[PDB]
Amino acid sequence: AAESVRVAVRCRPFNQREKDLNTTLCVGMTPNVGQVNLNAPDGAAKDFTFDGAYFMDSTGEQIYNDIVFPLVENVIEGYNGTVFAYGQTGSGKTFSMQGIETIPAQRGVIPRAFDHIFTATATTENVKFLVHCSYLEIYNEEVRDLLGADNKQKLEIKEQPDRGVYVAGLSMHVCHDVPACKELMTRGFNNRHVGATLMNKDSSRSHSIFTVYVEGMTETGSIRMGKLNLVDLAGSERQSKTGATGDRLKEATKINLSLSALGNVISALVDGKSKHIPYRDSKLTRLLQDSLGGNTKTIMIACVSPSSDNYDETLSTLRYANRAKNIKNKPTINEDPL
Ligand SMILES: Nc1ncnc2c1ncn2[C@@H]1O[C@H](COP(=O)(O)OP(=O)(O)NP(=O)(O)O)[C@@H](O)[C@H]1O
Ligand SMILES: [Mg+2]
């Protein structure tokens, strides 16, 4: 039967901008029951329930072990899996996906997924595994390869019933171990479009997708074809807060439009009346199409600011996250016999 997309909310500690503005804590949580509340200046609260609720003291270790670990186990079995970080600029999407390599509890989703996969392949002798990685970015409505030779070359999207939506000409890289995956992640990080604003000095100016392909040849002949999409979206932002001008501002209009398209896809999927879903409104929603309503086990990590200054932006993240938990997917094991 169909299963829901799983949603977790992560509230990061205050940033310097928020402390200088003398803002107050407007986010509350009861983690053991997945509860999150948002308080307005008058005191009125809006209550929500999610699959996970992680507060200012939460670690990447906790988040991964609780919600991501089962999904990565599903990819090893032959399922398609997707983890995507969503939220306002500077909320903690890149920190949640990449993290800090030198602090064990602070390592992100992506490096932990590499360790988990290669430990599972190393402890299985009756299945031979081949692991490939790809890494792309959607920058100003152009799909670009972050591991290719021409990072400026616009790539085209193709569709096929047995493959879903894919990127034609996207380079594929064999990874025999965790260092190989890390070398690609480093190379890709250097090529990703980034830029400074008053909301985030290290703002991601594109949506990124790191895909790990897990192919397993079983002793009963058959080939399992698991695939893990690790998605670090760009975030919603406002010119009055970022202070963005020129090219930085042009990126903001394309980022905001593509994120509005994702919101519209989420809303149409759960309104109970939309016969057609607007996946083609952006390259982002076309590449997330199979993850939202399709053949995939999906997790959204909705990141939020704890500050009263970001009440409106945090409320928007929570409303879309609340809607996303009702999206119904039909994941199946991808397994080609002989
Ligand atoms: N939970 C956290 N604990 C400590 N530092 C954090 C946390 N979350 C984020 N940060 C830091 O806060 C800054 C902004 O976070 P970042 O993950 O880059 O935001 P983002 O959601 O990806 N923003 P953007 O790319 O502009 O849409 C970085 O310096 C992070 O390392
Ligand atoms: Mg980021």
Residue numbers in the entry: 1 to 338
List sentences quoted exactly from the publication behind this structure.
OSM‐3 belongs to the homodimeric kinesin‐2 subfamily and is the Caenorhabditis elegans homologue of human KIF17. Similar to KIF17, OSM‐3 is involved in intraflagellar transport in the distal part of the cilium, and both proteins are autoinhibited at the resting state. The OSM‐3 motor domain shows the typical kinesin fold, with a central eight‐stranded β‐sheet surrounded by 3 α‐helices on either side. We have determined the structure of the motor domain of OSM‐3 either bound to ADP or to AMPPNP, or devoid of a nucleotide.
